[PDB]
């Protein structure tokens, strides 16, 4: 069944203006600049108003399989705009049973190494995505704080840490040590 048209819009705040280059959306938020293309999805991106900065996405005879991408595009932009006026922050607790997990932040938070995982002599160096920098939290004992503008880079960087510290050849129901996100918050709390 081909629908006539499915469309949904988002409302862009004043502090960031959005520029459209074909299917590439560019935001100019205060925290920086993030650019993303959408050429793999055939849609209609159009800026609506010069007073409230509305962006509209259409589908125009899409089946229910490609009806879902309309909200996905908007959600990507909504996370995209939120990431450049608010930022992202995924607090990462470090749970361990017997061996204390020793992590030291390398240059500019661009490299991090997990040293004493489960008492291994191996050193786990993991590189997070460019533009994402980690930081040891100061409020409480052991939790990594990483910031960024794009949700995918911050999340994928966070996932890199979570998968790197994993238990092999043992029950994972016990041996619950590792590094896992505690909450996926933001910055400026605004």
């Amino acid at each position: 069944m081909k629908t006539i048209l499915s469309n949904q819009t988002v409302d862009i705040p004043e502090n960031v203006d959005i520029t459209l280059k074909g299917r590439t959306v560019i935001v100019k938020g205060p925290r920086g600049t993030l650019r993303r293309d959408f050429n793999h999805i055939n849609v209609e991106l159009s800026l609506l108003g010069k007073k409230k900065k509305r962006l509209r996405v259409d589908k125009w005879w899409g089946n229910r399989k490609e009806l879902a991408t309309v909200r996905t595009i908007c959600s990507h932009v909504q996370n995209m705009i939120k990431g450049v006026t608010l930022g992202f922050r995924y607090k990462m607790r470090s749970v361990y049973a017997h061996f204390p997990i020793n992590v030291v932040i390398q240059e500019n938070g661009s490299l991090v190494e997990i040293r004493n995982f489960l008492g291994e002599k191996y050193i786990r160096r993991v590189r997070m995505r460019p533009g994402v920098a980690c930081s040891v939290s100061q409020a409480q004992k052991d939790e990594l704080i990483l910031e960024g503008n794009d949700i995918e880079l911050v999340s994928n960087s966070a996932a890199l840490i979570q998968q790197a510290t994993t238990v092999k050849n043992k029950d994972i129901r016990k041996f619950l040590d590792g590094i896992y996100v505690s909450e996926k918050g933001t910055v400026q709390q605004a």
Binding site: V95, Y96, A97, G178
Partner: peptide
């Protein structure tokens, strides 16, 4: 010896 809330946090990804 893990604090229970941290244990539940781990249980979210490993057990539950």
């Amino acid at each position: 010896i893990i604090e229970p809330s941290l244990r539940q946090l781990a249980q979210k990804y490993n057990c539950d």
